[PDB]
């Protein structure tokens, strides 16, 4: 298998389905990749064939070096296949203290000791190198919703110089240059002219893939999607485009009929672990008393192991209890179930027929 | 397969193994049961053969009746073998309040809402019934450690009355009769003549087990042994003896050298949740920093899933970061554990060998 091939298989107006190769293994598109920072046969199992690691918290605890002595993190978890890490970059911004920012990077104390820590474009692929990563992405600045046209320009032309200096720390590196694969973040904010200034920059860099960074974070869906709707097809058509931090069942499909390949999100594991369980006909809170004596599965098609063995009441009653029992089922249900949604876009997207199935997928969501 | 069938296969010395068949599978002795109020299977695969159900925690969550409407607890947890119950007696004296003693029986108030109940024989009986178990206790009042001769025998006393009036309520429920077992519960505290008086009155009454009750409540390794030599031997040979609430494993090791069959014990599970893990060379806490960097497993023998697959420096960082997957993992392996436990210890009195098992265990375990 090559460092990294991406191949569209099919197309239906914007979306496409196909596959990413690369060293560990071969990746679906539209890909949707869990955040493991369950046991690893149990997310393989789901259907994930790539998942997230959260540069920021590993570099806190256990540590990139840590990780590194232990022989990386594929061997550390026992997961064998690829494995994206993000930059460290936005929990910076959303979850550190103490922060100093600079056109060199950022220093901030840690939200767990107060110890002290930096990143920048540098350290943090020197950090995802420690850690062994298969997809890199490059450090950026972020920038808040709302942002003035200022603000936006100007963190977006920091991230741009960010993003040089994160292509060549990258290209250094020998062994991370041959074996791993990296990805540029197109910003600027909800700004076209921006976010084509950016994407020129990135094409002119050149990565292995484009994120859209700056969404999901306050604008809401229909500014989402209308900000897609002109920056997807600013960036090479044959690379990957990952929409970072999305979402929702609702925010992936119309993502996909935006153009994007590739998505994490926290909110199946969040939501598991708070009572929340997504379903075709839209998501339930199995906290709630009517579950009580509920003797169907969580959903009636899902053909997740929970949902072949185990009863709403139960879920129910386990989560009332505050038993761990019961955040594992609901957590394995809610990945395996985005699983579904992504095989159904790709099915329906090689059969040309997604066009349908984003409409009877909505009609019934939200009924 | 018959509602109840004890053989006893070998004997060395006072120690027993062999067999219990009940309707719903086969019991191999000296048995360990897990306390079960991990998934079903997970708990299977690591030896059990049967698992303990707490009536006390399941007729306040979620109910008796609830469970049994939605089909008992064997359907409702999705473990298909056998189940004992305990009686609810012993919760409702450590963990509720504004408790009512008296001879019919005992109201109480739950620790959870201050909602208000009551068990007597009758009813612990019928609860048991409804939740659908296959090992029916006894209900009976508790003694607690240390306890005068005059406190010790009326409480004796009332439990021998009680365990007559649990014997008519079990026969009285022809499917219960029919289709489960029941056992008694020796009382008497440390008193070799009480022992011997409830004894008596048990088998007067006639049970499908005996239980010696009312040890590992503070009196010590030493005084808890000492109880055993004279106490298993007032017990019909040829019925199961269940030693209720041990324990560590060199209690187990122990008990066994003095007749006993049959175990249940919290710390396999309660010591999973707290990083003790249980091993060959003793308890190890994995949370020790000595653990951060230590590529070994668990334990370097024994066979579970997670000594197959994590480092106890994964399992350290996991259980630091106060993951539920870290609590999953210790849980599982301390079952493991325990169920290798029991089956060395049945290999070594089917063997003759059970004297130097139980000498080269200690040796090692408090080395
Ligand atoms: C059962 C999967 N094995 C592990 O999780 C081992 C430990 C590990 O990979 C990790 C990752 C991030 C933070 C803390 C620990
Ligand atoms: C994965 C095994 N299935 C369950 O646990 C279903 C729910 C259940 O059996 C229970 C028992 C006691 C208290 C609360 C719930
Ligand atoms: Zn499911
Ligand atoms: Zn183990």
Redesign the interface.
């Known amino acids: 298998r090559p460092r990294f091939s991406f191949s569209i298989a099919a197309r239906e107006g914007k979306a496409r389905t196909g596959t990413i190769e690369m060293k560990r293994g071969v990746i679906r598109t539209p890909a949707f990749m869990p955040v493991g920072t369950?046991?690893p046969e149990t997310v393989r199992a789901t259907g994930a064939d790539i998942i997230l690691g959260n540069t920021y918290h590993l570099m806190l605890?256990?540590g990139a070096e840590?990780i590194a002595?232990?022989?990386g993190l594929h061997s550390?978890?026992?997961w064998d296949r690829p494995i994206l890490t993000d930059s460290g970059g936005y929990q910076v911004m959303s979850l550190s203290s103490l922060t100093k920012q600079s056109e060199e990077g950022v220093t901030f104390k840690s939200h767990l000791d107060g110890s002290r820590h930096m990143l920048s474009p540098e350290r943090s692929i020197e950090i995802q190198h420690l850690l062994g990563s298969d997809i890199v992405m490059a450090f950026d600045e972020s920038t808040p919703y709302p942002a003035t046209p200022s603000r936006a320009a100007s963190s977006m032309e920091r991230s741009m110089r960010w993003a040089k200096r994160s292509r060549d720390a990258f290209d250094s590196r020998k062994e991370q240059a041959e074996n791993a694969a990296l990805f540029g973040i197109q910003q600027g904010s909800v700004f076209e002219n921006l976010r084509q200034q950016s994407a020129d920059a990135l094409a002119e860099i050149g990565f292995d893939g484009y994120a859209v960074g700056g969404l999901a974070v306050g604008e809401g869906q229909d500014e989402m999607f209308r900000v897609l709707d002109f920056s997807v097809p600013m960036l090479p058509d044959d690379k990957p485009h990952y929409l970072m931090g999305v979402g929702k069942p609702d925010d992936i499909v119309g993502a996909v009929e935006r153009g994007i390949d590739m998505f994490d999100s926290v909110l199946p594991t969040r939501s598991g672990r708070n009572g929340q369980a997504f379903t075709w006909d839209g998501p339930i809170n199995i906290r709630n008393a009517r579950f009580?004596?509920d003797?169907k599965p969580l959903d009636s098609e899902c053909h997740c192991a929970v949902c072949q063995?185990?009863?709403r009441?139960?879920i129910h009653?386990l989560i009332?209890?505050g038993e761990?029992?019961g955040?594992?089922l609901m957590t394995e249900h809610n990945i395996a179930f985005y699983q579904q949604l992504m095989q159904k876009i790709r099915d329906s997207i090689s059969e040309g027929r997604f066009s349908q199935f984003a409409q009877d997928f909505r009609a019934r969501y939200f009924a």
Do not use: Q
């Open positions: 369950l046991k605890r256990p840590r002595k232990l022989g550390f978890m026992g009580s004596e003797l063995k185990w009863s009441a139960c009653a009332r209890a761990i029992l955040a594992m």
